[PDB]
Amino acid sequence: AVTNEEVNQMIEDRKVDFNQNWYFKLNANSKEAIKPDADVSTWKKLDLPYDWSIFNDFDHESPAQNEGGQLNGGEAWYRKTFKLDEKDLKKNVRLTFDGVYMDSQVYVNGQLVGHYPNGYNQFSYDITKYLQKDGRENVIAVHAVNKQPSSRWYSGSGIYRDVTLQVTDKVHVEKNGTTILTPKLEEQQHGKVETHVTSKIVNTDDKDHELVAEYQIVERGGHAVTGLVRTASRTLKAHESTSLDAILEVERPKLWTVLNDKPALYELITRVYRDGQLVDAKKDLFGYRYYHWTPNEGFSLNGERIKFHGVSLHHDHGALGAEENYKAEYRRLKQMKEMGVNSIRTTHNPASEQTLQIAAELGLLVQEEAFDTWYGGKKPYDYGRFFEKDATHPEARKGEKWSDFDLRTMVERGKNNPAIFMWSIGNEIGEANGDAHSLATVKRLVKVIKDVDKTRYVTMGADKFRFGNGSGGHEKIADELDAVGFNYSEDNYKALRAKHPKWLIYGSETSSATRTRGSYYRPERELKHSNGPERNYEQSDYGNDRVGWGKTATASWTFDRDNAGYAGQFIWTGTDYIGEPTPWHNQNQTPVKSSYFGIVDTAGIPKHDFYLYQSQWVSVKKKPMVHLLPHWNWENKELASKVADSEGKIPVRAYSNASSVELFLNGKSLGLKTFNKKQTSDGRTYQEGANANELYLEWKVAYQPGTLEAIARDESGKEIARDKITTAGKPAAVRLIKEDHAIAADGKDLTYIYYEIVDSQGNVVPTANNLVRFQLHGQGQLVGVDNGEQASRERYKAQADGSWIRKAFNGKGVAIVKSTEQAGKFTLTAHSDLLKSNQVTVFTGKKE
Ligand SMILES: OC[C@H]1NC[C@H](O)[C@@H](O)[C@H]1O
């Protein structure tokens, strides 16, 4: 009866983007916010998402302290009015918020729909009953509160992720109603794979209805791989719900994996019939993958043994603040992928829809984390105070606490995403010590998950294993998990592995090395928690700085590499984030406001350890590379004195995955050096330099201005890669570098344009801190500027006079430009005092 074209249209119309045409006002009058025909002339008209804190100036007296990035919170209201189309009058209406930070209240036409404490977990409300008859307009009012301190990192404030509207028939697939399982995949993979699908269907009508479900699987952006599979027609009574199911068979599916960068994804199409009429249709993304994990060998995915080469990530995007954005998150996860990362940990909260989708699309395994605390709390205004309180969500189950409800809904939201393979039910929970309360809580939380989903490893990240020999009552908590996460506990691994030979162990959080891009200090030393005044609020890009409880990249990686029973690690952190500026943590009269832990700075510019990791994790066949550090501008006595050795030479180091690297200074060879080849005690091959603690090759080079060039060669002496560093003259010009020639004209897509301070020959001046002023013309919108410098107190956003400015830091920074909905172009022009100006143009229009 109904066309495939029509079913796709129904699917498309089922969900709309609801981000547009909101009004915002900080400290607005409650009664004014929720009331109809209110005076919004005093409010800011905007499109969501919108993190209000990122527009503040830094405040040394912020109750957030520097750990929260010294950007204030407070309270505010967002307000939207909308009319249902005539044809949608009797339809079910659901409003989904991907994240609101935090402690929120939603009002529809004057009445309180729900109060939702969690600042990161997605929540939705059926608002059908709160709507007007006959189609007069409705008022959505959202109140968001960030009372500080509520966070150990920058949170942002408000509606920082998308909001979506679902308009469905009275008879429909409930929110998160789809379950897709492939329980015999390993066995069936070379033939027909049984795909067990389940739909929770609800009948919100007051009449009884006859119900049939019809399923089909298709390749995402590909063709159908099944026909239609029908369920038996059964009665669904008024105000009742039921689970339908079916088995579909897919022949030799392409298996989702981290081992390529465009893994195979599938979608289940669900068609719902109400008395033989197609009334509801839906798609659900999933993949075919299987995995196994043993105590002594670690992890394997579709039968291929791998290690988690992983990073921890906070949610902010530097100059974007907490505003989640598809392009921003894609950019960052693609960068992680380019580094050889195959796994992410969403530290320490539920992820956005963007993150989860992009992980599935790029082939990144995900640990999704529910809690940074249990009933104890870490910060006065964090989640702890809500953990054991009864959930008041209208769809909460009897006896559900917020912890129960929030854990359950997170798992229901993500149970079909192929990228997720671990659920974490806590990071460094101090209360989880093995006492009767904590033991009862771990079992309860494990079971909440298991009642939804048994296919993924339940875990926690625990730093308790680093104290003494690692033992204690917390071992009783670990015994209840599928896999035991070790925060910074490498030193006790041997002993703990001997004690618990059945544990699946990995590094849930490692390193916490601290680094500032382009800054260098005492390369000959390892520096522990070095935060003296002589450091000038910077840390060393040689990667020789680490916090008291931390390890260098080399120390934390070599240990992982050498032990098969330690399945991998999630480095703290993959990128910098606003807040937590250890080792100047909560020294609030100091200038620092953002992190040093990132492999990549907040502006998306990699620090040198990026290439260290790339050299270890990306095969010489996939991407031959060689990367040199430090810079070659040593004219400054102060800078050079901190770096030069006792003979005044500069330690020049190369990371490479090649067999050999030869360093040249101004055309003249300083020697070919060869990586030592070694094997792990279980027969895996690896390369190192002069000793076990050096993954680079080093030359002590006496300082002559000019050019360092490194030639990387395969075993047969064939050149496979080059890298070059040139001494720069004095600043002469600002140069702009486009990442994109064009982006989509959807008002959502954006582009990153780097600016560099260059000398007259076009070399980057690696020490340059020049102020740059920006002009934008055409069909675009500036939405951020950044240089990643931790000690900077510069605005990420427009100045109070509407201007856009930012200093270079160590030669570089970035400007971020969002598209509009009009096709055309925009031109970014950059100016700096007494330097040559430059412009670039980026086109906008059609999406790929
Ligand atoms: O080393 C910093 C790191 N410590 C461990 C915590 O889990 C992280 O959020 C962060 O605070």
- Measured in Å, residue 73 CA sits from the centre of ligand 1 at 22
The answer to whether residues 325 and 464 belong to one domain is: yes
Contact between 689 and 697 under an 8 Å Cβ cutoff? The reply is: yes
250 phi, psi to nearest 5 deg: -120, 130
Tally of structural domains, the chain: 5
Sequence-ordered list of residues with C-beta below 8 angstroms from that of 212, at least 6 positions apart, any chain: 230, 231, 232, 233, 272, 273, 276
Ligand 1 centre to CA of 458 (Å) is 20
Cα end-to-end distance, the chain, whole Å = 33
Q: Please provide the DSSP assignment of 448-466 as one string.
A: HHHTT--SSEEEEEESGGG
Tokens of 684: 């895996």
Out of 214, 329, 428, 580, the active site residue is: 428
By the 10 Å C-beta count (0-12 exposed, 13-18 middle, 19+ buried), 183 is classed as middle
Nearest 5°: the CA angle 406, 410, 413 is: 140
Verify whether ligand 1 is closer than 6 Å to residue 460 (CB atom): no
Residues 6 or more apart from 26 whose CB is under 8 A from it? 52, 74, 75, 76
H/E stretch holding 556 reads: helix 553-562
Q: Tokens 């020490």 belong to which residue? A: 767
Structure tokens at 698: 């080093």
The experimental method, as deposited, was X-ray
Residues 197 and 252 in one domain: yes
Q: For residue 505, what are the β-bridge partners?
A: 484, 566
Dmax over CA atoms of the chain, in Å, equals 89
Compute the distance between CA of residue 609 and CA of residue 374 in angstroms, rounded to an integer: 34
d(CA 281, CA 6): 10
Kindly report the protein residue whose alpha carbon is nearest to atom 2 of ligand 1. 512
Whether residue 427 has its Cβ less than 6 Å from ligand 1: yes
Residues 204 and 87 in one domain: no
Based on the domain organization, do 535 and 507 belong to the same domain?
yes
d(CA 38, CA 28): 12
Domain co-membership, 164 together with 217:
no
Q: Clarify whether residues 320 and 224 are in a common domain.
A: no
Give the Å distance between the CA of 372 and the centre of ligand 1. Answer: 10
Helices (H), 604-737: 609-617, 637-643
How many Cβ atoms from other residues are within 10 Å of residue 81's Cβ? Answer: 17
Mutate to test the pocket of ligand 1, among 424, 466, 572, 580 (most ligand atoms within 8 A of CB): 572
CA angle 346, 165, 351 (to 5 degrees): 0
For residue 204, how far is the Cα from the chain centroid? Answer: 37
Q: Are residues 311 and 401 in the same domain?
A: yes
Spacing, Cα 571 to ligand 1 middle (Å)? 10
CB 12, CB 125: distance < 8 Å: no
Question: Do 817 and 776 touch, CB atoms closer than 8 A?
Answer: yes
Euclidean distance between CA atoms 454 and 356, whole angstroms: 19
Residue ending a domain, choose from 169, 185, 207: 169
Range of the domain at 121: 1-169
Q: Which residue has the tokens 């990035």?
A: 69
Record the resolution, in angstroms.
Answer: 2.5
Strand partners, 373: none
If asked whether residues 444 and 490 sit together in one domain, one would say yes
**255 and 198 fall within a common domain:** yes
Residues 6+ apart with CB under 8 A from 16: 164, 165, 167
Q: Helix-strand-coil percent breakdown of the chain, rounded to 5?
A: 15, 40, 45
CA torsion through residues 495, 499, 501, 505, sign: negative
Is residue 50 classed as helix, strand or coil in its secondary structure? strand
Instruction: Decide which of 265, 290, 315 is a domain's last residue.
Output: 290
* CB 428 near ligand 1, within 6 Å: yes
Ramachandran angles phi, psi of 201, nearest 5°: -100, 140
Tokens representing 287 are 């993949």
Residue 49's SS3 state is: coil
Any catalytic annotation for residue 428?
yes
SS3 412: helix
